[PDB]
Amino acid sequence: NATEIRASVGKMIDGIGRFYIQMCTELKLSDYEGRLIQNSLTIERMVLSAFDERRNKDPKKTGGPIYRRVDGKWRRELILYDKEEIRRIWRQANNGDDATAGLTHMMIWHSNLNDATYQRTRALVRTGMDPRMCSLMQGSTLPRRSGAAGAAVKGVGTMVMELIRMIKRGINDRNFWRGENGRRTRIAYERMCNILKGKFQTAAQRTMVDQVRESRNPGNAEFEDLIFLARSALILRGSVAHKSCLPACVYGSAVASGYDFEREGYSLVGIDPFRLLQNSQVYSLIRPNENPAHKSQLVWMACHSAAFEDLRVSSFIRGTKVVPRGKLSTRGVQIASNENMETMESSTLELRSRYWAIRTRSGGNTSGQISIQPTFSVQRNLPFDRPTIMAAFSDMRTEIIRLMESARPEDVSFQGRGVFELSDEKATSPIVPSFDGSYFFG
Amino acid sequence: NATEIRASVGKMIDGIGRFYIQMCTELKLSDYEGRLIQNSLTIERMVLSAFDKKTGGPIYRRVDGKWRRELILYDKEEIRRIWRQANNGDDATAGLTHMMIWHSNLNDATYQRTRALVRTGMDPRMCSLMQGSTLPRRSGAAGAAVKGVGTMVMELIRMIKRGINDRNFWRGENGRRTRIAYERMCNILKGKFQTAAQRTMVDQVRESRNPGNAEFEDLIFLARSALILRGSVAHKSCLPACVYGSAVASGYDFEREGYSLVGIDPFRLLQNSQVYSLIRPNENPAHKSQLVWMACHSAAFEDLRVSSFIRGTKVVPRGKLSTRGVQIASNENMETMESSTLELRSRYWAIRTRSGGNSGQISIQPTFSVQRNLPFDRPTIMAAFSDMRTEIIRLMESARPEDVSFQGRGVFELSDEKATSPIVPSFDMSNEGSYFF
Amino acid sequence: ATEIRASVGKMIDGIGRFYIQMCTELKLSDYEGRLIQNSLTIERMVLSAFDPKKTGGPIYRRVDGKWRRELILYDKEEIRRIWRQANNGDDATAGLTHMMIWHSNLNDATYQRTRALVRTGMDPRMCSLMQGSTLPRRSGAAGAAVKGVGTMVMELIRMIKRGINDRNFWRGENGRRTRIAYERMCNILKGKFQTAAQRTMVDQVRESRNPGNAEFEDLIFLARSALILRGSVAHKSCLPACVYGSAVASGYDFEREGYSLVGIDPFRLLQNSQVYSLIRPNENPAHKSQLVWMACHSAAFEDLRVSSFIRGTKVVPRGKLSTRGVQIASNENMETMESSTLELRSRYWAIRTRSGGNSGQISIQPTFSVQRNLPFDRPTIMAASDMRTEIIRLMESARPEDVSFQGRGVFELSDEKATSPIVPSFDMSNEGSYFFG
Ligand SMILES: CC(C)(C)c1ccc(C(=O)Nc2ccc(NC(=O)c3ccc4c(c3)OCCO4)cc2)cc1
Ligand SMILES: CC(C)(C)c1ccc(C(=O)Nc2ccc(NC(=O)c3ccc4c(c3)OCCO4)cc2)cc1
Ligand SMILES: CC(C)(C)c1ccc(C(=O)Nc2ccc(NC(=O)c3ccc4c(c3)OCCO4)cc2)cc1
């Protein structure tokens, strides 16, 4: 049954790979051009665009920039395709299945890339949220209705942001909560509360989300409750899925080598993506301004959903220093329409790493003794568990402040868990780091 | 007069030592065997048992390169007689009590008492309050000093329930004497509390005519309060008999020299003594060692950080401790049994306290531009700004886990006999972890 | 900015030159010139000269293997003269003030001042607020920067009480000039507060036309508040004159080279200078050393763990400190008096602050299953009309274990330009590392 999942993920990767190969054939891209991440992005965006039901209710066409190697120089062409031609090729590549999962996979890869490329300081202040809540904004770029995969991967902040957005619409325009489809806007609000509720790993945070969901007329008080909850999630962190989702060319490349993902199985959270990246070859266009090592770090972080991970941890796994966004001499992977193709060079993206680690959906949340009884006449504090003991007596906000105050930045999580060698396939022999400088953005 | 007490406890220790030597001679134990802590336990249990027609238990011998367990038997009368002879014809209640309290300290450090707590309607996380829960219900004044707030609540809950179920418990000639016992226990509990409010609530519970469900609820509330407004509980370093016996066999004169259960003396005695333990296949000797050390100093429910600092080695939580306890069961396999030196020494010593915590500087003014917290004494400063449960919740809510207690008090060097130069522990380079259980 | 270094340089030059001239006039040996007791006397002679029309004090001499304490006398005019010559005819008020602050720092580190505090209706536990309480009431701008909130409050209470006793203090032509003194002092206090609330309450006090018992109460409240919402108080490393004297004699050119009271300069100067001290028979030289070190760097009220870290040896509480103070009283026995080198060096340096403490990512979201702590910025996150009430609210909110000076580190003594901060890792649960109590 573990292997049933590996086979289905395997099948999904296969599909994306096949589709990528087919798209390279139709565009008559060389093997070199096919491994250009910029070309991967365009091909990806085209297929997603082709299925965007929302958007598609010519403008019956899709496209974007394709890049070509023309005597060792890079030339940008803008191409155009029929959404129904691309939808047709996608289904053929996926054996007639509609392969929603594969579409969602590529979405989640874009999201991870967005989370690693753009601080969302603008979006946060315009919502009345604190711009320092950016570690909470995983998946803030995904479409509002996404997979179950879409929801697993969204951050607590993303979910709060979406709920705030709705509450505000309702305050400005007092007809948002009404109409014939008022009942379905209401269920949408409750649905999002429950998603949020399910990310929280304490009774008190879960109870506060119940209060918010159950709110008759959601307004300014619920705004305030949600801001408080988002703040709390900076310390009592929510469970957020982390999925290593790679550009389509990498899967395409591997399928073209005769790699059989379905037979072999595949996991977004185990060794597989690390192994696949150890042996794949991806190029990127790169601006004269830009350090290739920095471009490389960007994609690496995106590939493993690591924007908001401790740079210490990221560095240790990677074997190269993973550097803060403020020290990073690169602007991001897509190339604008106004950029001059003539001074554009290209390098190999370093996407490998020293070790691997499993990806978690955990936030790090941890009878028995809850106080000390002093034995020795010695100057010190006398520890006790203030959240639990005082819990015996009136607000959710008070319980949560207590827990937040109880938590200490130096509390250790994931006790026993470690990184692994790329030769340690079955994750037998953890290597626990020792650490002495940790946030990507700030 | 300080030195009067030292002499008295010295005389008690002497007696235990002499008794132990005399038992080792009767059993023809080698010096190694005499320092086996399992042997010490049996000998201890025999003498206590003799004062509660035959008595005995497992004695362990090194025979043909192996540890052999034999089961020995003695007349209570013969053991009593040897005890009195060892103690110069005194009855030596105190010496009996001392061994009892050692057993208790060992029990407290070996076994969480989760079972007992839930069966009483008490929360299993109240185990820091359960010191001495294993002692017999009537023991010394020494007995009662050493018993925890939780132990005392548990005893009074047990008695309230007996009175509910059997409505003849509080009535008759029997009921005059059970009543005085209930009051006596309420006073003992009262005397351990260090706030007027907690004391008043114990007065209300005592003064209850017909103690039932309301008093039960008062007592659990009190116990819960004692997790923050902690009670006074005596801590006494009481060592296995073999250690005293060993010392006495060296010509140590406890009566002339004097002894203290709360100053340097047990730490000095442990620096230079040598105890062994049987040890099971899966067991780490350093972990067995930590167990006995904690027991010896009554430190089961102390902050592991404090215990580490004094000891000089990491004192690790019960859940991370590869050992199962010091007595060996009768169905255990003696063939797989090895033995090791218990490491019972320590880097420093500290005075043992009966206190449970709470001019002079009460704040720091930063001088240097350096990353750190800025201490101040929040209890004292905020103190500048009529139902008893409400008063107590107010105090609990005031308190903070990082409030400092025992201001000015610190550990000592083993060469600082007179307790001249306290050293305040810092826990900066130290790794976290406060609760043994 | 290099104009300031040059002017502080010029001031230091002057003190050094003056000290060298005074050592010549007294015919002091190299050794005697570097004796801190002789430095103190020469210092308080010059200060005294600018306060019969004689001045002087104890000068100590190494004569035939014995320390001889002789009393010298001088005309205030002669010493004023020498001072101005040394300072090229400037009247070097700043230099006089520098020495005053050194004596103040030495006072703060030697004496608790519990007497003065009760006699003003202040709490004797307010001693962390009493930096500079020994300075003259008017001492230049340097004087005022260095004075604590408590000192300021104490001086305003002194003035309120003069106004109560003499019910025409506030009144006439002399009542206009006492009024401006009061307002000046209120403004100095106001400027040290880093909250709107505290500042508004100082406005209320200043604007009182007839200050009495209500303003007293307001100022005690404010002093209590500064134990948690701390004032800005300058810290200035001011060394004994003999150190500067020594340095000038070595051909150090403080005016060309520049100098800072808050940067590396005083640490470098002390690292490589050599100061001696008389020491009584029951005194530990290491302890005397600590005292002088703390005074030099104005560290009396600093967290001992911070002082310990910078210094490289344990900086020990005042109660554990075997020394009685640097001056020697007239009835002390010179025959039993020995002398040692003060250990004034340190392992690192740290910038001195005038601060009191208190967008981007402020927390981590774990991506990999890997053992580690989970950083977040606790102070920032947790941070989320009657002035008294506003202040009590903020005092009650504050957490002693909040970190201040985030990112700020110590430096190597080679690191002039403060290039490479080394950030220590203190335990934030620790709120006990006070010099006094
Ligand atoms: C997240 C999904 C798509 C499954 C969803 C779930 C519920 C709803 C909904 O609109 N209404 C609703 C009403 C009550 C609840 N209650 C709980 O979800 C709930 C109540 C108690 C719980 C708990 C969940 O988690 C496990 C233990 O405790 C949930 C949803 C919408 C979407
Ligand atoms: C030590 C003094 C000088 C008081 C002394 C004691 C006993 C004797 C003596 O005549 N007999 C004697 C009998 C027994 C012992 N000791 C033990 O049999 C014995 C005593 C204590 C033991 C032990 C073995 O095992 C290890 C430590 O605990 C020692 C001497 C002579 C001097
Ligand atoms: C600590 C007391 C004095 C209570 C004590 C300790 C151990 C014993 C004991 O049974 N044996 C024992 C063995 C060695 C020693 N002590 C020393 O070897 C010793 C003790 C102190 C010393 C010293 C050596 O030299 C360095 C510092 O001063 C003391 C007792 C008896 C009494």
| DSSP string across A45-110 | HHHHHHT-TTTT---SEEEEEEEEESSSSEEEEEEEEEHHHHHHHHHHHTTT---HHHHHHHHHHH
A301, A4 Cβ separation under 8 angstroms: no
| DSSP string across A173-215 | STTSS-STTHHHHHHHHHHHHHHHHTT--SHHHHHHHHHHHT-
Cα dist. C99→A406, B58, C129, C326 in Å? 47, 78, 21, 16
Q: Where are the alpha helices (DSSP H) in B284-387?
A: 285-296, 304-311, 378-382
Q: Locate the chain A residue with the closest alpha carbon to C376.
A: A409
Helix, strand, or coil (residue B125): coil
User: Cα(A269)–Cα(A357) distance, rounded to whole angstroms?
Assistant: 9
User: Cα(B11)–Cα(A58) distance, rounded to whole angstroms?
Assistant: 106
User: Cα(C80)–Cα(C54) distance, rounded to whole angstroms?
Assistant: 12
User: Cα(C372)–Cα(C394) distance, rounded to whole angstroms?
Assistant: 33
| Four-point Cα dihedral B77, B83, B87, B92, nearest 10 | -80
Å from CA of B99 to ligand 2 middle: 20
- A309 and C399 in contact by Cβ < 8 A? no
Judged by a CB distance cut-off of 8 A, whether residue A134 touches chain C is yes
User: Cα(B141)–Cα(B124) distance, rounded to whole angstroms?
Assistant: 27
Range of the domain at B135: 1-437
User: Cα(C301)–Cα(C95) distance, rounded to whole angstroms?
Assistant: 24
Q: Which residues make Cβ contacts (< 8 Å) with residue C406, sequence separation at least 6?
A: B371, C377, C379
Tell me the shortest Cα–Cα distance from C415 to chain A, in angstroms. 22
Reported as type and span, the H/E element at residue C387 is helix C387-397
Helices A2-27 and A100-117 cross at an angle (nearest 10°) of: 80
- B361 and C395 in contact by Cβ < 8 A? no
Q: Which two tokens stand for residue B234?
A: 């005596």
| Region of residue C47 (left: phi > 0; alpha: psi -120 to 50; beta: else) | alpha
Judged by a CB distance cut-off of 8 A, whether residue A398 touches chain B is no
- C224 and B381 in contact by Cβ < 8 A? yes
* Binding partners of C (≥3 Cβ pairs within 8 A): A, B
Q: Which two tokens stand for residue A46?
A: 């085209």
Å from CA of B268 to ligand 3 middle: 8
- B370 and C235 in contact by Cβ < 8 A? no
Nearest C-alpha neighbor of A347 from the set A303, A287, A276: A287
Chain B residues touching residue C297 (CB < 8 angstroms): 367-368
Q: Which bound ligand lies closest to the C-alpha atom of B349?
A: 3
Torsional sign, CA A132, A133, A139, A143: negative
Q: Where are the alpha helices (DSSP H) in C297-370?
A: 304-311
Q: Residue A93, Cβ neighbours under 10 Å: how many?
A: 23
Sequence-ordered strand ranges (E) for C191-247:
none
Reported as type and span, the H/E element at residue B339 is strand B338-342
Q: Which residues make Cβ contacts (< 8 Å) with residue A96, sequence separation at least 6?
A: none
- A374 and B393 in contact by Cβ < 8 A? no
The reply to whether ligand 2 has any atom less than 6 angstroms from the CB of B21 is yes
The residue among A327, A413, A415 with the most chain C CBs within 10 A of its CB, best to mutate, is: A413
Q: Which residues make Cβ contacts (< 8 Å) with residue A192, sequence separation at least 6?
A: A159, A162, A163, A166
- Under DSSP, the state recorded for C302 is S
Spell out the SS3 assignment of C43-78: HHHHHHHCCCCEEEEEEEEEECCEEEEEEEEEEHHH
B279, B285 Cβ separation under 8 angstroms: yes
Closest ligand 1 atom to Cα of A187: 10
Nearest C-alpha neighbor of B429 from the set C410, C315, C426, A433: C426
Torsional sign, CA C303, C309, C312, C316: positive
A154, A137 Cβ separation under 8 angstroms: no
The residue among A118, A132, A239 with the most chain C CBs within 10 A of its CB, best to mutate, is: A132
Q: Locate the chain C residue with the closest alpha carbon to B400.
A: C399
Tell me the shortest Cα–Cα distance from B372 to chain C, in angstroms. 5
Q: Strand C403-404 relative to strand B372-373: parallel, antiparallel, unpaired?
A: antiparallel
Of C424, C426, C437, the CB nearest to B359: C437
Q: Which two tokens stand for residue B192?
A: 């351990």
Å from CA of A166 to ligand 1 middle: 19
| Four-point Cα dihedral C423, C426, C429, C435, nearest 10 | -120
CA max distance for chain C: 80
Å from CA of B348 to ligand 3 middle: 16
Ligand 2, atom 17: closest residue by C-alpha: B21
C413, C214 Cβ separation under 8 angstroms: no
φ and ψ of B316, to 5 deg? -100, 150
Q: Give the resolution to one decimal, in Å.
A: 2.8
Query: Which of B18, B24, B248, when mutated, tests ligand 2's pocket best, judged by the most ligand atoms within 8 Å of its CB?
Result: B24
Ligand 3, atom 22: closest residue by C-alpha: B415
Residues 89-128 of A with CB under 8 A from C: 121
| Four-point Cα dihedral A230, A233, A235, A241, nearest 10 | -150
Å from CA of A194 to ligand 1 middle: 5
| Four-point Cα dihedral B228, B232, B237, B240, nearest 10 | -90
Which position has the token pair 């150190």?
C243
- B381 and C395 in contact by Cβ < 8 A? yes
Cα dist. C53→A309, B56, C72, C74 in Å? 74, 94, 14, 8
Reported as type and span, the H/E element at residue A19 is helix A2-27
Nearest C-alpha neighbor of C252 from the set C266, C238, C235: C266
Count A/B contacts: CB-CB distance under 8 Å: 142
Å from CA of A393 to ligand 1 middle: 27
- B352 and A376 in contact by Cβ < 8 A? yes
User: Cα(C259)–Cα(C2) distance, rounded to whole angstroms?
Assistant: 9
- Under DSSP, the state recorded for B9 is H
Q: Which two tokens stand for residue A286?
A: 């790169």
| Four-point Cα dihedral B244, B246, B250, B255, nearest 10 | 10
Q: Which two tokens stand for residue C385?
A: 């009309």
Of C227, C301, C305, the CB nearest to B426: C305
Q: Which two tokens stand for residue B15?
A: 């007696």
φ and ψ of A148, to 5 deg? -65, -30
User: Cα(B270)–Cα(B311) distance, rounded to whole angstroms?
Assistant: 12
Q: Residue C173, Cβ neighbours under 10 Å: how many?
A: 6
Task: Kindly calculate the radius of gyration of chain B based on its CA atoms and give it in whole angstroms.
Answer: 23
Q: Which two tokens stand for residue B143?
A: 């007995």
Reported as type and span, the H/E element at residue C149 is helix C149-165
Q: Which two tokens stand for residue B90?
A: 């005194």
User: Cα(B209)–Cα(B215) distance, rounded to whole angstroms?
Assistant: 11
User: Cα(C150)–Cα(C129) distance, rounded to whole angstroms?
Assistant: 5
Q: Which residues make Cβ contacts (< 8 Å) with residue A367, sequence separation at least 6?
A: B114, B123, B124, B125, B127
Exposed/middle/buried for A286, CB within 10 Å: 0-12, 13-18, 19+?
Answer: buried
Q: Locate the chain A residue with the closest alpha carbon to B402.
A: A381
- Angle (CA) C288 C290 C293, round 5°: 110
Q: Which two tokens stand for residue B246?
A: 């060993």
Cα dist. C299→A50, C110, C131, C203 in Å? 70, 11, 10, 31
Query: Which of B9, B246, B268, B272, when mutated, tests ligand 3's pocket best, judged by the most ligand atoms within 8 Å of its CB?
Result: B272
Helix, strand, or coil (residue B390): helix
Q: Which two tokens stand for residue A91?
A: 């289904």
Cα dist. A165→A175, A233, A391, B113, C190 in Å? 15, 19, 33, 52, 44
The reply to whether ligand 2 has any atom less than 6 angstroms from the CB of B34 is yes
φ and ψ of A127, to 5 deg? -105, -5
Cα dist. C278→B305, C108, C359 in Å? 41, 20, 55
B149, B223 Cβ separation under 8 angstroms: yes
Percent of residues in chain A assigned helix, strand, coil, to nearest 5: 45, 10, 45
Helix, strand, or coil (residue A380): strand
- C427 and B427 in contact by Cβ < 8 A? yes
The reply to whether ligand 3 has any atom less than 6 angstroms from the CB of B247 is yes
Helix, strand, or coil (residue C280): coil
| Region of residue B254 (left: phi > 0; alpha: psi -120 to 50; beta: else) | alpha
φ and ψ of A74, to 5 deg? -105, 120
Helices A2-27 and A248-256 cross at an angle (nearest 10°) of: 90
- C352 and B365 in contact by Cβ < 8 A? no
Solved using: X-ray
Cα dist. C420→A326, B370, C306, C411 in Å? 19, 13, 18, 7
The reply to whether ligand 3 has any atom less than 6 angstroms from the CB of B252 is yes
Count of domains forming chain A: 1
Chain A residues touching residue C370 (CB < 8 angstroms): 313, 316-317, 357, 414, 417-419, 432-433
Q: Locate the chain A residue with the closest alpha carbon to B221.
A: A392
Chain A residues touching residue C397 (CB < 8 angstroms): none
Q: Which two tokens stand for residue C267?
A: 């640490």
Of C363, C366, C428, the CB nearest to A360: C366
Residues 329-388 of A with CB under 8 A from B: 367-386, 388
Cα dist. B50→B72, B97, B121, B173 in Å? 14, 13, 35, 30
Q: How many residues does chain A have?
A: 442
Q: Which bound ligand lies closest to the C-alpha atom of A203?
A: 1
User: Cα(B416)–Cα(B418) distance, rounded to whole angstroms?
Assistant: 6
Which position has the token pair 């083993």?
B414
φ and ψ of B423, to 5 deg? -120, 120
B/e letters for C201-237, b = 16+ CB within 10 Å, e = fewer, are bbeebbeeeebeeebbebbbbbbbbbbbbbbbbbbbb
Q: Locate the chain B residue with the closest alpha carbon to A367.
A: B125
Ligand 3, atom 24: closest residue by C-alpha: B272
Q: Residue C138, Cβ neighbours under 10 Å: how many?
A: 11
| Region of residue B135 (left: phi > 0; alpha: psi -120 to 50; beta: else) | beta
| Residues facing C376 on adjacent strands | C363
Ligand 2, atom 8: closest residue by C-alpha: B249
Q: Which residues make Cβ contacts (< 8 Å) with residue B171, sequence separation at least 6?
A: none
